[PDB]
């Protein structure tokens, strides 16, 4: 019959349930975890604001068309592979956060499969030192 709103509903339902998932996840964090998570939001926003042009230049490097997710992942992780100070972890995470912000029209999967496995493991390594750095 009238199909002209079908895609809108599908799109808004995915956004809606992904958000409830996050809420469900946050709800089971204890207060210490909630406090660290908050520090992560704030530090990354600070870094994204203060290195905006750096990040824009870096963004244009990986927002080209002739590139796969594995290649983007390789470009981004390269700093950590040789230098894993928490400052670089924060820079790397903040950049990934910027990409997430900018790829709103893409499938969430194409941001999450940048972060997942190797990069998140590399950042999580010595997580205590990372937490100590931002807390």
């Amino acid at each position: 019959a009238a199909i002209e709103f079908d895609e809108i509903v599908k799109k808004l339902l995915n956004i809606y349930i992904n958000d409830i998932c996050t809420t469900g996840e946050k709800r089971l964090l204890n207060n210490y975890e909630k406090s660290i998570l908050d520090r992560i939001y704030k530090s990354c926003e600070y870094i994204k604001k203060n290195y905006e042009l750096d990040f824009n230049s870096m963004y244009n490097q990986i927002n080209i068309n002739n590139i796969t997710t594995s290649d983007i992942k390789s470009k981004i992780i390269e700093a950590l592979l040789i230098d894993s100070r928490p400052s670089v972890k924060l820079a790397t995470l903040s950049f990934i956060s910027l990409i997430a912000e900018k790829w709103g029209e893409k499938n969430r999967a194409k941001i999450m499969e940048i972060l997942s496995n190797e990069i998140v493991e590399k950042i999580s390594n010595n997580g205590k030192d990372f937490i100590d750095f931002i807390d």
Partner: peptide, 22 residues
């Protein structure tokens, strides 16, 4: 030798972050 530009810049930002957080 020469990192890809993205990694080169993240390391640059990383150094700068380190300097001010002191």
């Amino acid at each position: 030798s020469t990192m890809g530009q993205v990694g080169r810049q993240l390391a640059i930002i990383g150094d700068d972050i380190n300097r001010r957080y002191d």
